Symmetry: D2
Subunit: 501 residues, 4 copies
């Protein structure tokens, strides 16, 4: 039984061995990276069902990101399985500054009046919190009285009660006991700081990633189509037009501009972490269901992200609410589920991937009964999509073990995936860029093969590659689609129902 | 635009020329048949949309039926289009006898006192009507005072007021003004006459038709599966197992046994004339809709019959009730609509076929809006039926001008027909008997062609035959299904969507 | 079992006895009307299920119409049941003129060239057919070359090949053998003769009918809302605001303006006779289904008319197509079915009503399975309509024998009727005008009772009136709605489920 | 706007003040309970939306449970709002023992070797954990080498590596860093311990609760209908047949016997903590959705429990997975959501109830869009249920602010709740036991009132009580149901739609 829901696993120090030590043992950052022992840990995540690795450029310099990517290339050869490479941009982050005295945090009590400095390049005091704003912007004129400054996952609340025009400080009232640590995430909901459509830092991170070799870019805090189009222009300019863009929807503007963002992007990452601080937390499930339905209707990819197995950062078993979240993401229609801290920073990265895969594989068997997606309502807007509808109809009419598409660009695999057939989809393609580019599409098993000649029987090929990969055996029924014959067919034009020999 | 609902037309003197005279002209019957002039009249009915001719063996002898079948074979050569040949049996029925001195009929007024004889083997007079009871049964002890004897599909009622033991005659009162003609159907509701299992006359009639060459037998007053199986045994014994059997349901016993009759038969004829006298008339629309649904679910053929354009026997225009009836039969899901007196006996046989074709062609355009049949409900019970579902799905997803099937036995064409796709179905077949056997399946346009060899491109043949038939032109989209390749495929296994070159 | 579909029966000479003779016996028009013997025949139609009588002012002068209406008032007291009184207007009829020589018709052959005179007040010749146009209009400039003049139910076709500007004659080619008799209906499709919105003759007929006492006006050839509003103004002006207007839809303009006509009228009569000559005959069933759905959605009354049991003009049993038409009108959603010639002019007026009632009563039992109307899709646009939806829900949830509404104006009965509950609707009302005005609403049994006082138990009343009328017995469950309490309630506000004692 | 999904909150030390100290402060446990200060804390939970308090008899003795129930009775008087009292039994379970020297817990590191004792009636030490096995069973021979002993809802794993016959001790290896605290649940998957039919301790616990005054019993680890019927027998014997029984489903035997457990019980608690260790964790979402559907179909109460806001035990904000879990439980169709450690043991008990109330209130607004429950599918099995269907239909047809039922036993309110109308349900009842018994039914706001006399207007009382409760104001539309009149009606038989004066 193959996992149809794809897993994005964030890499980090959790899987990295340094001079024979695990993450957190003292002196770990003293030692050098053991590339081979790190690659063996990553290979186990691949074997357990990670389909794509996320390189979070919020954390770690270009040297760290570049070595981690090179480590995954070894892991793929140990696992005998390729994975997608996804770069996630820093974007317009605000962080608390370093503290004076090297005193790494202070604790505060409800009611207690302090100040937030807008002035950049300074250090924090306990009385006056300083912010590291992306691109060193001045945020003073953008934040009115009665907004909230939220530190570390919205855990510590600061109410802006007055502004000191003379020092450009917010006069803030602590709303609840809590810590302000150095370098923690800050959110200020319901404000419109003029961050550029694409900051220089993100331009540089993307160009670096494109040079290493990536398949996907997840763009943090996408507010408009313009934030996607500016990254598109760089991919185009550098000969990386094959790279797919996922817009991260994590604030109100992104939700408000969702339709134009979906049209410009290849896919959406539902970035629930920031989204649930930036909009009312109880609205996130409403927006999750609505985004998955819209992205599927567009024939594009949706990733559900953040806190999916959060408890597994510290414990070997997830909570009942975490298992419920992963299961309900699948039923809602998600193409992919994601791990952040659980695979990057936690004690149980392999078990986190294994647990998510178990949940995902169980949930896919209930899509027939409880699935929210309804392919019956779609307009079939092309002949390939007409063939994708007919494939879904065959897999509803009888027990089909596997759909096989011979796909030059993956267009036929994406359309079949959009219809969510009751079968795995083997996408036989003729280059590695197309192969890796399909790795986050629901149900698609990408596989590299030789371009078939005008004299080759593609139905025989389809069956032999399915049997070689161990996906079918004697007596199984499969559906095969292709453009026949090669050199004359302009598109996928043929469906065959075949019993494996 | 092509007619998908098939037309059965009953042949009779209405279309026949005798010594230059038309049916109805003085001295008509004193002339002999003009075969060529009659064949040109029948060729016009073929051209207007008659798909099959009904030869009712309840009227006229073997020589008359045999010459009429020969006239139709000539009409096919004149029209350049083949039709089906359907034999309709007498069955376990009562008919009025020939009259003394070959008077054809008499007229009667309400209140006249006449007699009906039970003695077999004699002729009627105006005052004493004799019955031809199948099996030459004596029915005198089976009919009580107060029963009603109905002649000509219930057009004339005779009340049994007394019985004469001396002559074994019913003394009857004429209930309403009307005609008693020779060889007219007689119904005596609420009576149990013990008709034999298969009358000797039905045995002779079926063996004579099978010798002449027929494609269908319509079995009158089918009571049980055994009434079908007995005719099947004759078809198999004489080397005519290709012949298809339609059970006529026209009494309560046929309705009580419908399920076992459908399993034994190739189709049902809803014989509403007898049915609406033998069962409460107000139940016939209920039974019509339920029969159409069950036969379609079984992948078999249903023919709706009797009174469909009754007024056009005498007048050039149908009533509003008749147009409604033909329209609602199509919407109910009928494969075929029938003409009886309108084509066999009326003044407007060509206009009747033309009018029926016009109503049928309009009603097929309303099948998506109003159609009663629901193919989404069917179990797909075989790999050919899975392909038929997928074809229907293709015709629902985009504008398909034509479905082409390359079919050895017609099985693939019968299963595509069952699903009622939004397209015409070109059935390319390799023998005339399979070709004519498909002529009453909804939407099917049968065409004879050479059996493809293993080196032939069946998709090229399909398009070429469709373009040669004038069914499609450059730029139309067609669906083609075939068992690929010839000499290896077990069944239809391939669907191709093709733009006509 | 009560008939929920209402019957409109046209009265005429068929039920009228003159000096002890039936219609058609020689000297019948010599004798005087036997009022009492005529009233006894009409009472039998009432008992057999006629709910409303149609007085067709196309045929018979004011004296004939006035005596027939007075005859029905006696019939109601013999039957012990009231009926609606419907006036049907002549409207813009064109008829063939009287012939010179008193020679009542001529027969014609295909190809034969003749002339149609537009000049009014003259007599017809065999060579030159003259027309009696409503209001003596000149139709010459309105009819182009290549229109068709159709005589007697579209039976004889005349193609206009040229116009003689000098004599104002059409030069016409007979298209098919046929008779032109004196005073037959003429149609000229696809022309726009400027007949007034309301002719003086129709103004006079309506004022006469209003003076005798009518409940309904069916307005012939309604083209726009203006043709309904002009009759509305007369009903209002004369103190007859209670009179309900049915627009007859019988031509293309009426179909084109259907939405504005439904908004201005109380109901639609689908006048299929003219409609099927004025538009293509095969489109009439499409328009019938669409009109019934739209009129029901508006909460108004739809009557399906013409040819429903046509054969029963001359024979005691209807055809299978006639039974199918009446059954399918019921399933389509019609409130009422109508008889014209069958009850007015035929040999079997009582049996025609009885047959139609039998068909209607059988069909209502299949509305659950096959009914085209869908009340689930309606907007509930008021609190009374919300109560009508809840009543329908109760009758779907359990077996309810009867809904009882205490209704001052009938508004609650019409809304409950609109939802088509699975029960009869007893409408207890407090005046005869409201009572008769409900007689064509699906399922409504109108019954006159005393206005309940603020101290009366309306639920006890509802049950006693149901038991007195023989509609329920001991152990039956009924739904009762009322405005409680009387004098305080502004509308129907209460639903009760009650077991009969 | 009112919360329709009910909240069960587990009470514990988190809300209790002891000698002026809060839970967590130094010397807390050296103080005695401050009853009034604790009652004010609990009153805040009632005000935030706690509808019922859970007293878990697996923790603390009779005196502690008895005083806590007394503190809640005071909290009700302070809040001016009544709550439900639910007793949660030990059942056939294993718990960790008290520690020697009333240490409350110890911390353990991965790889530590410790022992688990099987001997009953002793205390734990850090190195030797003792079990309290219901029925004082010896489990030494029931647990093989290689089994896993899990403590605290699977937070800490112990691998059985060897068995010591000399002490009847399991030698175990600590699988992961964690705490072993006193009276924590112990699970040993894939083991068959023969627990008795009803432990003596459950008998004493149930009889003590029934003496104190409770409304609900939640029966832990219900295996069969007999586990419910044994508690029912005690409730009936002691004169407490009003008490409602929720079966907790938390093992495979409870799932295998679900149908017979639902028929025996008044409700189900989906006890996901134990369930997700006793059955594959990935099956718990499948069982949750199926249990919710079956219990709703039975017109009974379903409570979703455990880990719903787990992170808010320690942090002021829930994860995205937790908000999703609460949201999806509401959408699945749950009557009620539960807090355990969040309210009993955490730092943010008030904020947990507030957060749950906010998610629940938002999710109820999405029930028409996304709701899994389908009331259209139910058989209406009684005249009260027919009225509940009609109420739901009224709330679907227009904007109803409130449904008021005048209900002696709560039956009408339970059936309206079952149908999930788009409105709040005010249940006016005449005794406190019926009033508190309705506190966990979806949408029901119970309120005590005088039994109407035969001279009272129940529709006036309904509106007045609703306006006095502040649930509606002038101009709102309400539906009221009642058995009219008092002293004659058998059941609810009347629905009124009323505009509030
Ligand atoms: O798919 P099914 O229903 O088992 O039909 C299989 C049978 O159909 C056939 O293909 C006949 O099909 P055609 O006559 O349409 O070519 C046989 O060869 C075969 O045995
Ligand atoms: O309609 P059902 O389901 O038979 O219920 C009838 C029973 O309901 C009751 O009315 C209880 O209803 P209430 O407690 O809601 O008033 C009983 O008097 C009666 O016996
Ligand atoms: Mg983010
Ligand atoms: Mg017959
Ligand atoms: Mg007319
Ligand atoms: Mg438990």
């Amino acid at each position: 039984m193959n996992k149809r829901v794809k897993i994005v696993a964030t890499l980090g120090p959790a899987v990295e061995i340094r001079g024979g030590k695990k993450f957190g043992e003292d002196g770990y950052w003293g030692e050098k990276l053991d590339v081979e022992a790190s690659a063996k840990n990553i290979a186990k995540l691949i074997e357990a069902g990670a389909n794509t690795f996320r390189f979070n450029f919020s954390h770690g310099d270009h040297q760290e990101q570049g070595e981690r990517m090179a480590t995954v290339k070894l892991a793929e050869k140990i696992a005998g399985k390729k994975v997608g490479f996804l770069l996630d941009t820093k974007g317009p982050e605000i962080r608390t500054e370093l503290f004076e005295g090297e005193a790494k945090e202070y604790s505060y009590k409800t009611g207690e009046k302090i100040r937030v400095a807008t002035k950049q390049g300074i250090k924090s005091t306990r009385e006056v919190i300083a912010l590291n704003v992306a691109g060193a912007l001045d945020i003073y004129d953008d934040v009115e009285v009665g907004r909230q400054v939220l530190v570390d996952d919205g855990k510590l609340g600061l109410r802006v009660v007055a502004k000191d025009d003379a020092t450009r400080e917010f006069e803030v009232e602590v709303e609840n006991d809590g810590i302000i640590a150095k370098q923690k995430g800050v959110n200020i909901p319901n404000t419109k700081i003029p961050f550029p459509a694409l900051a220089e830092r993100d331009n540089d991170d993307i160009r670096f990633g494109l040079e290493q070799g990536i398949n996907f870019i997840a763009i943090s805090f996408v507010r408009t189509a313009k934030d996607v189009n500016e990254v598109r222009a760089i991919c185009e300019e550098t000969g990386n037009g094959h790279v797919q863009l996922f817009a991260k929807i994590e604030n109100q503007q992104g939700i408000d501009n969702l339709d134009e963002i979906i049209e410009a992007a290849d896919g959406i990452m539902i970035a629930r972490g920031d989204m649930g601080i930036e909009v009312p937390f109880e609205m996130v499930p409403v927006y999750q269901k609505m985004i998955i339905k819209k992205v599927n209707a567009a024939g594009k990819v949706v990733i559900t992200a953040t806190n999916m197995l959060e408890t597994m950062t510290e414990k070997p078993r997830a909570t009942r609410s975490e298992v419920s979240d992963v299961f309900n993401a699948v039923i809602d229609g998600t193409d992919a589920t994601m791990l952040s801290g659980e695979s990057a920073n936690g004690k149980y990265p392999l078990e986190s991937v294994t647990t998510m895969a178990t949940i995902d594989k169980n949930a896919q068997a209930l899509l027939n009964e409880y699935g929210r997606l309804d392919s019956d309502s779609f307009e079939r807007n092309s002949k390939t999509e007409v063939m994708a509808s007919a494939v879904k109809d065959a897999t509803s009419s009888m027990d089909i073990k596997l759909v096989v598409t011979l796909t030059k660009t993956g267009h036929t695999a994406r359309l079949i995936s959009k219809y969510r057939p009751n079968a795995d989809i083997l996408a036989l393609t003729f280059d590695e860029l197309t192969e890796r580019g399909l790795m986050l599409n629901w149900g698609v098993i990408p596989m590299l093969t030789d371009a078939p000649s005008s004299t080759d029987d593609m139905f025989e090929i389809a069956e032999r590659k399915a049997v070689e990969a161990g996906l079918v055996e004697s007596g199984d029924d499969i559906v095969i689609v292709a453009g026949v014959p090669v050199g004359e067919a302009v598109r996928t034009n043929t469906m065959r129902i075949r019993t494996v020999r």
